[PDB]
């Protein structure tokens, strides 16, 4: 596992030097954007029911056939199982979000999650469909304006972006 | 432990014991030896009928379909398990039989009994057994092709002093069985999070005398009191007594309301 | 390629009745193992059995180990 | 799915065993429910349309708040009202598959296992379900041992929902 | 213990559920068999001693030297026919605790649990035994659902032994 | 696992529609079986020490080169393993006819059986053979006549003949 | 019970180790956090009546059949809107633990930790008690790093409601 | 475990009451000592094996009994086990001292630990020696005035010196 | 590695949790330290030659016999002097990389896993360790923040070699 610190910490000792003086000052940046990151986290975390079930049923809305019978989110239990990995996709994009690097990500939810939906039939194009729902729906929750300190979070905005498109295309 | 502990405790072969581990291209002796120890440690050393044994996932672990870890689920799920453990006891001390038999230690909290009790009540036998199996504590401890062993006598990571205590009371040396419907020794322990004094092998044993009456033994008398005469001074109380005062020691506990917790020859 | 009928459960659920082969790769030394007992014996593509009921356990067993999941196959 | 067939088989798989006399007389008694199973499940199939309708219109007088308030999760409009028969045609599809399969297998593999945080998910009451399963034992009309199996596997999902 | 009964309770409380359909129609397949398994092991009990005595008799006209050769292990003494006719009893009387029961769990917990133990420790031949339940088996005298039931016990404990 | 009604009912639910009359008629048919499917069931369990021991003897009468010293039956482990094996198919033959449906033989004991066997040098077309004798033993005792109430059973061994070629063809 | 200074000695005793400096942290994050809490905690306490009080009447607002329809877990009589304003007071104390804790502790172990048991064996609607946490969300009036935190705990509880 | 916090918490749920102004105020000024709290924590880690060492030593000149051969301190087996009971005990003293609770200490490490020591046969009273030496050490690394802000640590140090106290009533 | 970020999330991934407020605590505490730490990573590694020299001469000097011992282990020749200057290099560049990461992890990861046996199969003797770190702890300038948080690891270390 890494976050944004331990991955320049990995790379240098690799190179077996200390950091230099422009990625110390990189990661005073990413200090100085870290309330960003925390709040959004936040925002996300605080709406992660809404994110989740507004995706899921916008996606069946849009592909009927996962829901019809004989589709993979057909039956109860299928049904749970969608909805809960919908929950694990959002919980580890915002683990990655929090660490500020993409290891947790990558190391324990994508490992071996493309080759999870082969071997159980399952559509991965619409878990990325719903992943992408879930991208809008929570980009535009972290990008809501009310009742916060105004500030520009483009960076942080791009960067849970970039999280939720590592997922999408892993189950694709 | 060391060994002067270890003979007066009697745990010396638990201390002496050695983890046994399924490597690869083990021979049809080690596979029989693991086979063998699993049966031992997971229905709690019992006299394993050859009726009574999985041939089928023994022929898988021989095989090398299943691992180590494969198959003590197996047996811990199969049927054999569930008469001797499970269907004629009560939910608490199966969890404890659990520990012992799966992970080789006491439970250390009440909330393990709240746990695997919920755990039972939602998911059945199935996942209340493989909750002990797929957990953390056995990944490391034994991971896929070590046979579990007993560890409640060693200092662990993430372990509570009790737990060595209380390995005592689910351990009760090595000739003995998890066999006879019994109820738990750990219940008001682990309910009221307190310790019990060990009394295993010698350990138990006080000093006599002239003091003992005619066949020359005493009994302890572990019991709960209270005010109901003289000033009490402790809640626990100790007693030994002689074989020929035992009955008046009783009945004078019992008419003063005290609660008897154990009765132990010393 | 046997197995099934000891690894899935004795619980008759139609989607417990499958079990998966795991292929798992660079089973190194982790902080998450420091204090495993046993010692690593490979760290090349092991296979690891897996029923459908535990494959959410497992696939999180070999994450915290670093293990990467190289390909899951119906057994 | 459990049914009376499978479930003997597993233990004795369990245990290695040959099918031994318990096992044959658990068939014996599968046999003896079986043809009101398979009674019970065809009557219930050939008025399931109105069982359906009747049920649903049920859900609406016990509770019109449904019918009324707007939401996702409510029949206010056309598509709650297909998405609500569609679930009471699923909880009825799946109960006399229950009646075929001599238990309440079907149910806890397709219906029941993962129902509450469905009904979590979506802002569903289990209540609701429960009045259209009581209209439902209230109106199939069903005799004899057909009755008493289906109103088992209708309360089953009864006593899991609530 | 192998009974219907005790089987459909062990099944329901090793999932923590209560008594479906399934566990029913276990109970009914029980009592549709239980009066018929009665009177087997009323039959039984009837003509206990002539049939131990007579299986007694077909092992040893099967097993000549069993009679003859000096041992501990044989019948050549009067102690050791009392032994083979206590042994014999013992399979008719648990094999009539089975049709009580209506499973093999008498068979299972008294007798074929360790037998081999047993007939390898005492050097007791299980043919012998195999051959005084076949001649229980042939001289019983019943019919039907009571022949059937008694000989699924007598041929398991056949089984057992071989 | 599936019995002979779950099966249907597994169909039915994917395709999300009632059973049809002609389903419940065919289904009806097999309770009217249901005697003497119990009955075949009894005779195999009842015979099944004799129908292992006399089909191994006769497998190992013909092909004398399994029981020849580094045959594959040679030393008393692998001649425990082979007789384990033929009890453990005909067990699972009684089960596959007791539920009515093949899903039972094949999941638990015919899937990679052929791939184990390849695997541990066991050969398939032997222990096959031996299937084909425990088919001729077990129809023959299903197939009598005598102590029974005579009827007619043409179905039940057809099923019972299936069974034990589903047994025979995958284990080659 | 969740609370940072709690889950690091958790996390440092796991591991076996000493109190590092990643622990300090921890409890340099608590420490600064927790003033926002304890003011978060007294605000809320201090408005607990009009809040619970509030919550009610909102609830019962959305939900208009709670206060006609009769049933033991509707409002429509006193007792059963002492009951709804008793629970409401429950979330709202527990959430002022919360900030008093630091941490989602205290929901964990006396309110989330089997919520979904009891809203189905007495059928109280979830969707309820979040209306009541929407409106102690839209009216405790606290601003800043009090309302953050509050907002937190009480999301908390609403996503496990739903 | 609980924590300073959790403890007023779980009273008061009992009592099922808010806290009230008197403990709010109470725990505030809790926290506002929170940073004597962290750098106590500190100075016993970063001289844990000092003190520990300097213990062991002292203890040993003074109750040589111990490591005289037959003691139970004698082998390196038994040595390296008390060792590691001295660095045990400090160590959930630490933790008592970082959650400002005695939970931890109590629950995980005191319970049970004088049954253990009277089992094991470990001189109870030797350790509540031991612990005193600990004591003593670390109450003069948390006081040490070289190098740290001028303030008064004295509440604090109590509250180290209780859990002490406690550990030393535990084991004998 | 080991760090207030990787930490907060594994222990809220071990319990399958969304990232709570105790998580977000512990992120405010890490940004807290998280500058200070970076000012000591760059004091450290902007003097990290004179450090090193010093502290290799420091153990030189109170362990003169490395300087006219000969053995593969000690600094006797060019070739020694080489390895203990670069080994007392890896220890304050690891000490540098726990201060950009606000925990021990590099050290852990890096140098104190196995150091142990490193120091016992190669004759190193971790009191010349335990000496340069005191020498670096008294000569590195740092001040505040900084100089706790570094002093931490450096007695992190000294307590992992003593
Ligand atoms: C082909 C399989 C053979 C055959 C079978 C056959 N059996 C019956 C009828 C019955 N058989 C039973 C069976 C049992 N009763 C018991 O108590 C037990 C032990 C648990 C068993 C196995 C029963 C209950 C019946 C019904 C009543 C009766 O005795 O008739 C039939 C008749 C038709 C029917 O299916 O009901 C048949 C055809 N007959 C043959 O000729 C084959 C050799
Ligand atoms: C009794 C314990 C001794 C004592 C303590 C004391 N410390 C402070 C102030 C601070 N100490 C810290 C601590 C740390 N900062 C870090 O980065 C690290 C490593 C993670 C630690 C341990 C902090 C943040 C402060 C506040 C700022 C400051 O530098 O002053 C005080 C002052 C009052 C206060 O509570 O802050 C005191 C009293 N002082 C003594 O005299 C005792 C020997
Ligand atoms: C929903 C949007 C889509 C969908 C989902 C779906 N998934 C499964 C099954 C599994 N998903 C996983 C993945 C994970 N489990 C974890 O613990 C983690 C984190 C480490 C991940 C990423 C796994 C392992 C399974 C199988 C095991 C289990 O479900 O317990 C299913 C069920 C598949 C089946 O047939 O049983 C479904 C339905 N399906 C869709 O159609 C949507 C597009
Ligand atoms: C035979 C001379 C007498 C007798 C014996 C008897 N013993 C048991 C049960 C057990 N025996 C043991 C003993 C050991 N197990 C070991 O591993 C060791 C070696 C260290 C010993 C000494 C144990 C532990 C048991 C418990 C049960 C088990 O199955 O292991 C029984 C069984 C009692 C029962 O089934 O309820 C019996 C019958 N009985 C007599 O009547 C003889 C005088
Ligand atoms: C009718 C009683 C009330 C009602 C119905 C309603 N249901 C949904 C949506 C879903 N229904 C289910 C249920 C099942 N799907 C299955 O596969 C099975 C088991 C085989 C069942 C019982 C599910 C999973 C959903 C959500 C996904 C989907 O839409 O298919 C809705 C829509 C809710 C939403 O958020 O879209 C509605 C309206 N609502 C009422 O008001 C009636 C009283
Ligand atoms: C006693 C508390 C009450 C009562 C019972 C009663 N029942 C019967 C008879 C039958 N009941 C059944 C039961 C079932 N058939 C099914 O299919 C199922 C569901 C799977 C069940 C539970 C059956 C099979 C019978 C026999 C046939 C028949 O219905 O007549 C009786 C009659 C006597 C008998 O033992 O058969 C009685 C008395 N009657 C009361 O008044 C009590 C309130
Ligand atoms: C009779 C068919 C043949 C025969 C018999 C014979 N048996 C024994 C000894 C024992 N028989 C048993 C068997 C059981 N005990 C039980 O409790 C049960 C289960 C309910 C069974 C089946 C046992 C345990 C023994 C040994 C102990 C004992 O003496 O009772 C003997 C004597 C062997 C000896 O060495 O004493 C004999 C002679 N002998 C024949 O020749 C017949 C053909
Ligand atoms: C006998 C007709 C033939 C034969 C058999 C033989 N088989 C093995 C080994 C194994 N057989 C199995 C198969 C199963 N085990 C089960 O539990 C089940 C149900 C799931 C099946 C179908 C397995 C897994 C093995 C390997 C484990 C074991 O060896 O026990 C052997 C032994 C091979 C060896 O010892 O290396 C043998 C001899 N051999 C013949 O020649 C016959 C044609
Ligand atoms: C109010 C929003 C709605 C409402 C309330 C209502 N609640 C109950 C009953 C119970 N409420 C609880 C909840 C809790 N108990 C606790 O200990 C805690 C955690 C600290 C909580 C959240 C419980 C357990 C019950 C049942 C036992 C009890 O009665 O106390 C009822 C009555 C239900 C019944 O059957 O008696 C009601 C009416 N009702 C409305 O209409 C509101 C919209
Ligand atoms: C980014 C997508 C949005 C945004 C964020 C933003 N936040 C701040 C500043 C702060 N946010 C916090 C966060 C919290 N305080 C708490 O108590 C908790 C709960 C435990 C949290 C999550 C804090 C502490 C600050 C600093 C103090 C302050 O309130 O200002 C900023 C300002 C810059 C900064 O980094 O401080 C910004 C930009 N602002 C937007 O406009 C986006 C929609
Ligand atoms: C040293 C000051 C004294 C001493 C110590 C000593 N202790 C043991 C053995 C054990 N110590 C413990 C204690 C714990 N284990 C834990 O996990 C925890 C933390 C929660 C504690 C407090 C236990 C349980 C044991 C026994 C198991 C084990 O040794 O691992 C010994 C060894 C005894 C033996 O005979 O081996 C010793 C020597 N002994 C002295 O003489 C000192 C006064
Ligand atoms: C200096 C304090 C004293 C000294 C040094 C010395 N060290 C070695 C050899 C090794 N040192 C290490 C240490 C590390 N390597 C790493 O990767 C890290 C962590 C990042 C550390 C701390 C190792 C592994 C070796 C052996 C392999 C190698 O040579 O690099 C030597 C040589 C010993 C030998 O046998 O060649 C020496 C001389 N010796 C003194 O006298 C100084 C006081």
New binding site residues.
């Given amino acids: 596992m890494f976050d944004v610190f331990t991955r320049v910490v990995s790379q240098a000792d690799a190179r077996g030097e200390y950091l230099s003086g422009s990625q110390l000052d990189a990661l005073s940046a990413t200090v100085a954007e870290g309330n960003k990151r925390i709040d959004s986290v936040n925002r996300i975390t605080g709406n992660a029911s809404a994110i989740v079930s507004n995706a899921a049923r916008a996606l069946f809305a849009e592909q009927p056939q996962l829901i019809q019978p004989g589709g993979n989110a057909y039956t109860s239990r299928r049904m749970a199982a969608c909805l809960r990995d919908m929950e694990i996709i959002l919980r580890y994009v915002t683990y990655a979000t929090f660490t500020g690097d993409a290891s947790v990500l990558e190391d324990r939810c994508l490992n071996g999650l493309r080759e999870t939906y082969v071997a159980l039939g399952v559509p991965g194009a619409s878990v990325a469909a719903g992943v992408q729902k879930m991208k809008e729906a929570a980009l535009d929750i972290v990008n809501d304006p009310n009742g916060i300190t105004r500030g520009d979070c483009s960076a942080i905005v791009a960067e849970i972006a970039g999280y939720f498109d590592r997922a999408a295309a892993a189950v694709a | 432990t060391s060994l002067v502990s270890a003979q007066r405790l009697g745990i010396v072969a638990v201390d002496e014991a050695i983890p046994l581990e399924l490597r690869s291209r083990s021979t049809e002796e080690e596979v029989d030896a693991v086979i063998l120890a699993v049966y031992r440690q997971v229905l709690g050393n019992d006299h394993l009928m050859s009726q009574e044994r999985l041939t ?1 996932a023994e ?2 672990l ?2 090398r ?1 299943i691992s180590v870890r494969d198959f003590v689920r197996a047996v811990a799920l199969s049927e054999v398990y569930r008469q001797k453990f499970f269907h004629s006891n009560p939910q608490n001390r199966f969890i404890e039989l659990n520990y012992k038999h799966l992970l080789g230690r006491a439970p250390y909290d009440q909330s393990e009994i709240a746990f695997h009790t919920d755990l039972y009540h939602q998911g059945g036998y199935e996942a209340e057994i493989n909750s002990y199996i797929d957990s953390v504590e056995y990944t490391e401890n034994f991971g896929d092709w070590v046979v579990p062993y007993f560890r409640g006598f060693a200092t662990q990571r993430n372990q509570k002093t009790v737990g060595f205590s209380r390995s005592f009371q689910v351990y009760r040396g090595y000739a003995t069985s998890d066999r006879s419907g019994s109820r738990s020794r750990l219940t008001r322990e682990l309910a009221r999070n307190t310790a019990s004094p060990v009394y295993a092998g010698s350990t138990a044993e006080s000093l006599r005398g002239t003091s003992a009456g005619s066949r020359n033994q005493m009994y302890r008398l572990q019991v709960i009191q209270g005010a109901a005469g003289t000033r009490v001074r402790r809640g626990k109380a100790e007693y030994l007594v002689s074989y020929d005062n035992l009955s008046a020691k009783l009945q004078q506990i019992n008419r003063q309301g005290d609660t008897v917790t154990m009765i132990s020859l010393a | 390629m ?1 197995g099934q ?1 000891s690894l899935v459960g004795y619980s008759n659920t139609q989607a417990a009745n499958r079990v998966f082969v795991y292929e798992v790769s660079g089973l190194r030394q982790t902080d998450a193992n420091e204090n495993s007992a046993h010692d690593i014996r490979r760290s090349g593509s092991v296979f690891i059995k897996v029923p459908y009921a535990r494959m959410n356990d497992e696939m999180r067993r070999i994450s915290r180990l670093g293990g990467t999941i190289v390909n899951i196959r119906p057994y | 799915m459990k049914t009376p067939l499978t479930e003997a088989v597993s233990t004795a798989d369990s245990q290695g065993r040959f099918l031994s006399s318990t096992e044959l007389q658990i068939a014996f008694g599968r046999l003896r429910q079986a043809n009101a199973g398979l009674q019970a499940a065809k009557a219930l199939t050939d008025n399931a349309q109105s069982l359906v309708n009747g049920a649903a219109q049920a859900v609406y007088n016990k509770f019109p708040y449904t019918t009324q308030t707007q939401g996702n999760n409510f029949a206010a409009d056309q598509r709650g009202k297909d998405k609500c028969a569609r679930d009471i045609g699923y909880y009825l599809r799946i109960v006399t598959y229950c009646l075929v399969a001599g238990g309440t297998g079907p149910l806890d593999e397709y219906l029941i296992a993962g129902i509450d945080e469905i009904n979590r998910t979506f802002d569903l009451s289990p209540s609701w379900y429960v009045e259209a399963l009581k209209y439902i034992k209230a109106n199939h009309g069903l005799s004899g041992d057909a009755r008493d199996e289906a109103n088992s596997y209708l309360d089953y999902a009864i006593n899991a929902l609530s």
Avoid: D
Wanted: hydrophobic letters at 25%; aromatic letters at 0%.
């Fill in positions: 089928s022929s898988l021989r095989g379909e | 046997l009928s």
